[PDB]
Scaffold this active site. Structure first.
Site, mmCIF file in Angstrom:
data_model
loop_
_atom_site.group_PDB
_atom_site.id
_atom_site.type_symbol
_atom_site.label_atom_id
_atom_site.label_comp_id
_atom_site.label_asym_id
_atom_site.label_seq_id
_atom_site.Cartn_x
_atom_site.Cartn_y
_atom_site.Cartn_z
ATOM 1 N N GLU A 158 -41.913 -97.444 75.358
ATOM 2 C CA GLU A 158 -42.735 -97.543 73.998
ATOM 3 C C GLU A 158 -41.955 -98.218 73.026
ATOM 4 N N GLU A 162 -35.170 -60.607 50.571
ATOM 5 C CA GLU A 162 -36.070 -59.929 49.604
ATOM 6 C C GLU A 162 -35.810 -60.195 48.151
ATOM 7 O OE1 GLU A 162 -36.538 -55.657 50.322
ATOM 8 O OE2 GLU A 162 -36.820 -55.931 52.264
HETATM 9 N N1 LIG Z 1 -28.298 -48.613 36.744
HETATM 10 C C1 LIG Z 1 -29.005 -47.769 37.741
HETATM 11 N N2 LIG Z 1 -28.803 -46.553 37.322
HETATM 12 C C2 LIG Z 1 -29.511 -45.596 38.136
HETATM 13 N N3 LIG Z 1 -30.110 -45.868 39.196
HETATM 14 C C3 LIG Z 1 -30.341 -47.056 39.540
HETATM 15 C C4 LIG Z 1 -29.811 -48.210 38.663
HETATM 16 N N4 LIG Z 1 -30.209 -49.359 39.493
HETATM 17 C C5 LIG Z 1 -30.958 -49.068 40.440
HETATM 18 N N5 LIG Z 1 -31.289 -47.627 40.404
HETATM 19 C C6 LIG Z 1 -31.732 -47.011 41.501
HETATM 20 O O1 LIG Z 1 -31.547 -47.662 42.703
HETATM 21 C C7 LIG Z 1 -33.079 -48.147 43.450
HETATM 22 C C8 LIG Z 1 -32.410 -49.514 43.715
HETATM 23 O O2 LIG Z 1 -31.758 -49.633 44.815
HETATM 24 P P1 LIG Z 1 -31.845 -50.746 45.969
HETATM 25 O O3 LIG Z 1 -32.029 -51.998 45.033
HETATM 26 O O4 LIG Z 1 -30.783 -50.632 46.841
HETATM 27 O O5 LIG Z 1 -33.162 -50.587 46.590
HETATM 28 P P2 LIG Z 1 -33.594 -50.515 48.310
HETATM 29 O O6 LIG Z 1 -33.312 -49.101 48.818
HETATM 30 O O7 LIG Z 1 -32.917 -51.338 48.922
HETATM 31 O O8 LIG Z 1 -35.202 -50.444 48.433
HETATM 32 P P3 LIG Z 1 -36.031 -52.056 48.081
HETATM 33 O O9 LIG Z 1 -35.162 -53.144 49.011
HETATM 34 O O10 LIG Z 1 -37.454 -51.752 48.756
HETATM 35 O O11 LIG Z 1 -36.162 -52.454 46.680
HETATM 36 C C9 LIG Z 1 -33.723 -48.079 41.834
HETATM 37 O O12 LIG Z 1 -35.062 -48.309 42.437
HETATM 38 C C10 LIG Z 1 -33.334 -46.899 41.265
HETATM 39 O O13 LIG Z 1 -33.946 -45.483 41.715
HETATM 40 MG MG LIG Z 2 -33.349 -53.368 48.797
#
Ligand SMILES: Nc1ncnc2c1ncn2[C@@H]1O[C@H](COP(=O)(O)OP(=O)(O)OP(=O)(O)O)[C@@H](O)[C@H]1O
Ligand SMILES: [Mg+2]
Ligand SMILES: Nc1ncnc2c1ncn2[C@@H]1O[C@H](COP(=O)(O)OP(=O)(O)OP(=O)(O)O)[C@@H](O)[C@H]1O
Ligand SMILES: Nc1ncnc2c1ncn2[C@@H]1O[C@H](COP(=O)(O)OP(=O)(O)OP(=O)(O)O)[C@@H](O)[C@H]1O
Ligand SMILES: Nc1ncnc2c1ncn2[C@@H]1O[C@H](COP(=O)(O)OP(=O)(O)OP(=O)(O)O)[C@@H](O)[C@H]1O
Ligand SMILES: Nc1ncnc2c1ncn2[C@@H]1O[C@H](COP(=O)(O)OP(=O)(O)OP(=O)(O)O)[C@@H](O)[C@H]1O
Ligand SMILES: Nc1ncnc2c1ncn2[C@@H]1O[C@H](COP(=O)(O)OP(=O)(O)OP(=O)(O)O)[C@@H](O)[C@H]1O
Ligand SMILES: [Mg+2]
Ligand SMILES: [Mg+2]
Ligand SMILES: [Mg+2]
Ligand SMILES: [Mg+2]
Ligand SMILES: [Mg+2]
Lengths: 455, 456, 455
Positions: B61, B278
């Site tokens: 072809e 994510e």
């Molecule tokens: N500067 C900060 N001071 C206090 N707590 C914090 C701070 N930054 C984030 N967090 C807490 O940690 C969380 C973020 O954690 P992470 O990003 O690891 O989430 P995850 O458990 O991976 O969940 P997902 O991926 O579904 O968001 C926030 O929702 C809050 O509760």
């Molecule tokens: Mg997370």
């Protein structure tokens, strides 16, 4: 009553209730690479080896030399069988072939005949008339001939022109069903005119030995490796019994399997460990962390380890591998770590059928089998009720996590023990070096079968 | 015995237990754009770039120039190989072809042959067999390992077009391109091999710049996860050659642990890779810095590499091939996937299980510490670890669950399991501040803390 | 490496990794009314507008005038392009057409060619030989021609005679799959000989702009309209962040969306409200009942309301409508009330894919997005775990009913907040005029995540 001729094909002699109807032709239809050729050759080969009967193979596509080369992969020297005059390869690659084949029969005094892809000897209204004539000419010779036909669909027309089934007296269908990107070789006897047979599909595999169609009760007690478990079991497990270790991930199924396998090697008994989760590398380290030298038992030629992934091979193969290993090594006891790893991405019908094959073979060889199972709900007791493989195990050892004052403590209990008394108490046990330690039970805690007991 | 010849195609050499039967014709049927031509080319090319064997390609072809230009995408210079007399592209776009092909045999000790779209050589079943049977013989007598390429309409229907090109062939290879919910998945299976044995069922393969990529120890050295308390709860720290799992509800702190885990590597001057599915690269740098860890600093030191992208973008076949390829170049000491749950969205449990096995195998077979995160699809969390079919392959499980304490959503961490190592068997309450995870004491007063709502 | 020519079709330039192989013909098969003609014209039109390259359209069914009339619905004056000599409509409604087409190419120095339903130029053994010849003659001219074929089934033969795919170097399939009495326009690149491309189907829509193939992280904080929520969030939401308001029906998702939209208009910021449940009529009344004049913000040209039913249009369209509105109005923040209304009678795959499109576009334009979601179980916390769109939201505001002494009291809590501290307490809030009021939490109540707390 029609007499049957033993094909000497491991299994087919039981599924066909003896073998193939004598003096009648059998059809062996199937898709490309099902084993229509292997069966046809294996039938003749076995005939000119066991019953010492002459066998004429009629080829229509590939040459008589290629068949001997292909058959050389199973260790069958077809040239030696042709050199001795016990086999005659009729290179035919329709009355002409009839007389040519008829002569060859009496010319070598053949008892079994095999036609290679009779479909190619017609490359539907005409196929019937032709096939009917060939079926009759072979019936007059009184030679048990095996016919090979082809099919496009695995669950469609039996043959190609969908008329090679009503013309044949016996019909064997070879299938290679694809389910979840995994090929499963199944053999079934569609019909047997004049005699009885087993109905439905039957798991088979092809190995170096060829096609492997796979259709007591002493009070002797053995140790599990734990004196407390032996006391809880009422003097240890039974010899020819199947034990089950169910529990959530990280409960100590492998620990128990290891200790159970060590105990064998301690009494100079051969043991096999079939791992499907961890690797021998990880197994040796983890085991050694519990004061157990697995390399030692491998050097004493008592313990044998064989790990491999569950999605790697099919259940039909996995079973064949277990049997083969057991036949060679001839273990006193074996352990499967684990069954839950072999049921992932598998039909419950094919798992059940697989589980029946290992327990049957272990129980029919006086071998103690410790099968571990990972629970799919936290409440492991509720995972045993769904488990349709708990009605085949004689002993059940349940491991369950217990939330105790903001701590994840473990718990062990002899859930059941057929024809033997056992401790019916949820004993708390911890894990450390040189193995575990079963303590007392939580008599002041309620709903300990939930995984969160109440004071 | 049948001697197999190595094709030097990553995977096929193991799936066919050595390669292709020597002096035999192998069929490679498949739908349009499956990789039939690429296979037939790669087979010959590798034959003249490894075992220095003159290969004769046949065309029915597309022109001989187009094939040379098409193969220029993978970085294969066919023109140079043609000029060197180490390749012959016989232009054919009945017994005539046999004679010419039979003449090309001793023409330059031709060991490898490849015929493309043989279907077109009978597109103008009863006659197709007689002709197909003839070629198999003429080539069988030539004693040259040829590759036959047929085409098919249905992915789960007839093997070839006339459903007769499989019974005439000694070997059969089926190339598939199934549409798994608006997502194409390239699969290769060996239907059969007249003579020798082979692996059964379809095998996930991907096509890249390298061509077809068919994808069929245990030390006590401990490493830090970034947290001292978490290392103390693991009885020293994570195992170097081990797969860790961080499971818990959304906003539990899976990414926090992943970040602290990747930081600790760069702290010890170790290379690390972050596979985000994510959060965005830019989003990951802001959140990380909010905990008191400079990610941009680690990218400037060439220690930590961040590669984030959407899960619905590519397929698991590709996603895995990316991780492998990106690991081969960068050669990380430890990696992290955030997260596995994000890669299991709109994917068959069968294809997801195969993915985790392929990724956990590579991390374990390269002495790379892997922290795979998974968002629990239940509030219980522990109940999600039970369904989790990937928790049986995991060595260490770090469970993160919420706890309703006096009308407050407090966080709790516990080492659910730790293979061949002691670990703290307690549900320790922890908090997140502007410096990282702060693990405190457990709840001895509270009961049923595995539910997500305890009681004194 | 084969060079690609940009089709200037929004999306196709990224899915084909640049565009179509230069000097080679591309097949664009599909069922009737898929957009095989629109693509073929749009390709040429864009070519004689951006790259200023001559383009010859070969018609086989409809007249050269009807094409200009049909193309006039997208605002493409094809007569002006024909009058300027930048387009040549070859009315052909097989070597004759080859020379006729070959001449026309050099006669106008054409760079792009498009054949209209090549299927009609054969009204299977002959189609191949003919199509192969036409594919070659165009290859010698070195003109990037686009072929249009027809198909009967959406998941069957690629072309009509199922042989127009192996003859073509590139294959583009246009689909119009009917799922739940809803048509979904999908475009995929089956194959690209010599180069790479994106695999699998891709949601596209046809609008007044033609085919619309649809394949930072600042610490700036914005107000949600509630001082308590801003304090609970640790200084309000982030600018380029996606917030989620989950809760059972009548919790106050719309109230929050309204207040969040008002706050924008308060700081003279443009905002858009996408309603899929309530109507602007009901929205204006309900809003006004919470001391908020939405008609005012509509008169200030700050707030824009666009309500419509979820089962009215497809997810592909809904997204196109959002983008289009955002492009024109250019809002500072937007709110979707609600996502749970757009997921009803939709596949989880098409919803996920839709949700990824809005959040991606909102996050890649520094726009604050408040997406509301109605829980499907009473325990809203358990509805967040199933919600596979909670792994894409940075902030989650959970609203839950609380059975308090034979009373249905409400409760709000910042479930999560990426890279920001938030109040981790279930605060009780009531609703009244000029909006809500967040009080204290139920510290003396247990299992408040169930919806029935214990004293
Ligand atoms: N500067 C900060 N001071 C206090 N707590 C914090 C701070 N930054 C984030 N967090 C807490 O940690 C969380 C973020 O954690 P992470 O990003 O690891 O989430 P995850 O458990 O991976 O969940 P997902 O991926 O579904 O968001 C926030 O929702 C809050 O509760
Ligand atoms: Mg997370
Ligand atoms: N040296 C040790 N000291 C104390 N506890 C240990 C030690 N080694 C392992 N453990 C405990 O035992 C567990 C390992 O037991 P094992 O591997 O048998 O679990 P399992 O239930 O079979 O797991 P799987 O889910 O992998 O089948 C660890 O998770 C830990 O709790
Ligand atoms: N040595 C071996 N060990 C294990 N399996 C083998 C071995 N040799 C062959 N096989 C298996 O058996 C198959 C050969 O079966 P056989 O040649 O009888 O095919 P068939 O059903 O007659 O098909 P066809 O008629 O289309 O050629 C191989 O494709 C392979 O799957
Ligand atoms: N102005 C427009 N705005 C939005 N959609 C439009 C507009 N004009 C046409 N369409 C859509 O595009 C379609 C026209 O596509 P086109 O004429 O290219 O069909 P086709 O796929 O070539 O089918 P066939 O070859 O069977 O006529 C209409 O049926 C309609 O769905
Ligand atoms: N450089 C590349 N990178 C990635 N994928 C590529 C590359 N080059 C080609 N491909 C892929 O391979 C396909 C072409 O492979 P090939 O030409 O072997 O197809 P085929 O299976 O022989 O089909 P046909 O026989 O119908 O032409 C392309 O459509 C594309 O999906
Ligand atoms: N003027 C008011 N005074 C007090 N409470 C009010 C007043 N207006 C509304 N509410 C309360 O707020 C609720 C309406 O809030 P909203 O419409 O935001 O609920 P939602 O959770 O978004 O509902 P949907 O299920 O329609 O999405 C009413 O059911 C009522 O409980
Ligand atoms: Mg055969
Ligand atoms: Mg285990
Ligand atoms: Mg090809
Ligand atoms: Mg049209
Ligand atoms: Mg509402």
């Amino acid at each position: 009553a029609i007499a049957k001729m033993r094909t000497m094909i491991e299994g087919f002699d039981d599924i066909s209730h003896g073998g193939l109807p004598i003096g009648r032709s059998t059809l062996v239809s199937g898709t490309s690479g099902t084993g229509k050729t292997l069966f046809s050759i294996q039938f003749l080969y076995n005939g000119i080896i066991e019953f010492d009967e002459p066998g004429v193979f009629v080829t229509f596509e590939e040459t008589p030399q290629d068949i001997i080369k292909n058959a050389r992969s199973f260790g069958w020297d077809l040239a030696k069988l042709v050199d001795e005059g016990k086999l005659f390869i009729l290179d035919a690659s329709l009355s002409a072939l009839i007389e040519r084949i008829n002569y060859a029969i009496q010319k070598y005094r053949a008892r079994r005949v095999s036609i290679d892809s009779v479909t190619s000897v017609f490359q539907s209204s005409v196929v019937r008339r032709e096939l009917f004539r060939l079926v009759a000419r072979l019936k007059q010779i009184g030679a048990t001939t095996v016919m090979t036909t082809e099919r496009i669909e695995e669950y469609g027309p039996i043959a190609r022109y969908g008329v090679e089934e009503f013309v044949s007296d016996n019909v064997v269908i070879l299938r290679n069903v694809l389910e979840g990107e995994r090929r499963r070789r199944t053999l079934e006897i569609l019909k047997l005119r004049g005699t009885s047979h087993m109905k439905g599909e039957y798991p088979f595999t092809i190995t170096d030995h060829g096609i492997n169609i796979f259709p007591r009760s002493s009070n002797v007690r053995v140790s599990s490796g734990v004196v407390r478990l032996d006391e809880m079991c009422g003097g240890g497990f039974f010899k020819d019994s199947i034990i089950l270790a169910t529990g959530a991930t990280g409960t100590g199924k492998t620990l128990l399997v290891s200790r159970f396998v060590e105990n064998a090697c301690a009494n100079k008994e051969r043991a096999i460990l079939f791992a499907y989760e961890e690797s021998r590398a990880q197994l040796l380290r983890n085991a050694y962390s519990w004061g157990m030298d697995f390399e030692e038992m491998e050097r004493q030629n008592l313990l044998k380890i064989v790990c491999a992934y569950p999605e790697s091979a099919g259940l039909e193969d996995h079973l064949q591998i277990i049997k083969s290993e057991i036949n060679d090594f001839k273990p006193a006891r074996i352990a499967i770590d684990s069954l839950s790893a072999l049921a992932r991405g598998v039909s419950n019908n094919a798992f059940r059928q697989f589980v029946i094959g290992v327990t049957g073979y272990a129980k029919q060889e006086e071998i103690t089998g410790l099968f571990t199972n990972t629970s799919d709900q936290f409440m492991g007791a509720h995972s045993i009720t769904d488990s349709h493989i708990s009605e085949i195990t004689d002993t059940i050892i349940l491991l369950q996590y217990v939330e105790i004052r903001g701590e994840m403590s473990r718990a062990i209990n002899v859930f059941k023990m057929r024809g033997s008394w056992h401790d019916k108490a949820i004993r708390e046990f911890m894990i450390s070096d040189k193995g575990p330690d079963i303590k007392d039970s939580f008599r002041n805690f309620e709903r300990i079968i939930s995984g969160s007991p109440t004071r």
